[PDB]
Write a protein that binds this ligand. Structure first.
Ligand SMILES: CCCCCCCC/C=C\CCCCCCCC(=O)OC[C@H](O)CO
Ligand SMILES: CCCCCCCC/C=C\CCCCCCCC(=O)OC[C@H](O)CO
Ligand SMILES: CCCCCCCC/C=C\CCCCCCCC(=O)OC[C@H](O)CO
Ligand SMILES: *C/C=C(C)/C=C/C=C(C)/C=C/C1=C(C)CCCC1(C)C
Ligand SMILES: CCCCCCCC/C=C\CCCCCCCC(=O)O
Ligand SMILES: CCCCCCCC/C=C\CCCCCCCC(=O)O
Ligand SMILES: CCCCCCCC/C=C\CCCCCCCC(=O)O
Ligand SMILES: CCCCCCCC/C=C\CCCCCCCC(=O)O
Ligand SMILES: CCCCCCCC/C=C\CCCCCCCC(=O)O
Ligand SMILES: CCCCCCCC/C=C\CCCCCCCC(=O)O
Ligand SMILES: [Cl-]
Length: 262
């Protein structure tokens, strides 16, 4: 009842489009899961955890998208020409809780292919995960107010954005100071990964703000469309680039299975 989805009835077209976006997302993530599993054998031991992390991200996100899809169909029934709320079973809060797990995985796979190790790896991962959890937790509290108190959504969102900015500064600083260590020309690729991340991750706060600027049933659809674009870009496309970097550096380091695969 704290999310705008509960305020509206939906046309068949709106309801089915949201359902199809979520189910398509499930399929894309589980198809990518198989790809990452199969190619892990072509990654040198030093980087193989990066591809395993993509597998974990695919199943984590795919399970949450599947849960959202079933919750969506459980919550609404077609009555008198529209889909109307029957049960309090749908909310976006499950996405936020899941980010507590998937964001650390996405960040850790980056640090691994950047060739960080030992104390710098552990220290950098700790600050990044704390910053990310601060961003997620404050955003989670903010969206509890997207119906009742837009001013509160905005203030928690400002606090969350401060964590996002500091997190991005840590990431960008480590990338630019370490790309010279990267093998096989991936010093160029990693810069594109950073820009892909900046673009894709910024779509999430835009979705968070939909209740402030498009508080209607079409805004509900737009938010799910933005989450879909952002999920595929930040998890699947990003994961494919991380895997490319991992295989390319593996081959440059003399790992035969990587050399033959390329
Ligand atoms: C009264 C309410 C409380 C107000 C306070 C809440 C807001 C504080 C937010 C950010 C400050 C922390 C930023 C400090 C981060 C420095 C550590 C760091 O980033 O290390 C990166 C390094 O590159 C890796 O080795
Ligand atoms: C809540 C409202 C507060 C609004 C606050 C607005 C300030 C935005 C500024 C920067 C965004 C952070 C983007 C980080 C981009 C990476 C920067 C970086 O990596 O620096 C390069 C490095 O110095 C080379 O060695
Ligand atoms: C969802 C679509 C996944 C299917 C193909 C993506 C291929 C994109 C290439 C990403 C880098 C991986 C690579 O090039 O090497 C793997 C090769 O297939 C070793 O047999
Ligand atoms: C696969 C999921 C990903 C990459 C999720 C990323 C989420 C964010 C970058 C969330 C950012 C937020 C803000 C910067 C302020 C508004 C609240 C958030 C949590 C939506
Ligand atoms: C190879 C693997 C290919 C992808 C595998 C995905 C298989 C089917 C996904 C099932 C999602 C169905 C959810 C429907 C729930 C609902 O909307 O009511
Ligand atoms: C589609 C189902 C799985 C296909 C992946 C199994 C084939 C293994 C190929 C690995 C190799 O070439 O060494
Ligand atoms: C309060 C929360 C703090 C969370 C900190 C998490 C720390 C994680 C640190 C690094 C994990 C990396 C483990 C795998 C190392 C891979 C390196 C390799 O095998 O080449
Ligand atoms: C359990 C998750 C791990 C928590 C550790 C991460 C700490 C990060 C920043 C804490 C942010 C505090 C915001 C809580 C206030 C919300 C409220 O009380 O209404
Ligand atoms: C770490 C968290 C940093 C500070 C969070 C401050 C936001 C609190 C807004 C509360 C709004 C209210 O209840 O009146
Ligand atoms: C996620 C990015 C967050 C950006 C920070 C928000 C910037 C705040 C700008 C002006 C706030 C104006 C407050 C007006 C409250 C409206 C109350 C209402 O109409 O219900
Ligand atoms: Cl997720």
């Amino acid at each position: 009842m704290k999310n705008i989805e509960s305020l509206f009835d939906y046309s068949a077209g709106q309801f089915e489009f949201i359902d199809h976006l979520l189910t398509m997302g499930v399929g894309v993530h589980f198809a990518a899961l198989i790809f990452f599993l199969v190619v892990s054998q072509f990654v040198a031991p030093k980087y193989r955890i990066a591809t395993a992390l993509s597998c974990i991200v695919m199943v984590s996100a795919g399970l949450i998208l599947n849960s959202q899809a079933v919750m969506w169909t459980d919550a609404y029934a077609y009555v008198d020409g529209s889909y109307q709320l029957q049960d309090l079973t749908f909310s976006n809060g499950y996405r936020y809780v899941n980010w507590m797990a998937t964001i650390p995985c996405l960040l850790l796979q980056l640090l691994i292919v950047l060739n960080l190790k030992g104390k710098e790896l552990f220290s950098t991962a700790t600050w990044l995960i704390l910053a990310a959890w601060g961003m997620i937790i404050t955003g989670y509290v903010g969206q509890l107010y997207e119906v009742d108190d837009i001013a509160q959504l905005m203030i928690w969102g400002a606090v969350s954005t401060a964590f996002f900015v500091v997190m991005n500064w840590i990431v960008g600083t480590k990338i630019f100071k370490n790309r010279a260590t990267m093998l096989g020309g991936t010093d160029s690729t990693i810069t594109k990964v950073f820009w892909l991340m900046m673009f894709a991750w910024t779509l999430y706060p835009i979705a968070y703000l939909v209740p402030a600027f498009m508080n209607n049933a079409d805004g509900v659809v737009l938010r799910q469309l933005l989450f879909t674009i952002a999920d595929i870009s930040s998890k699947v496309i990003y994961g494919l680039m991380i895997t490319y970097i991992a295989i390319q550096q593996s081959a440059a380091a003399g790992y035969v299975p990587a050399q033959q695969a390329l």
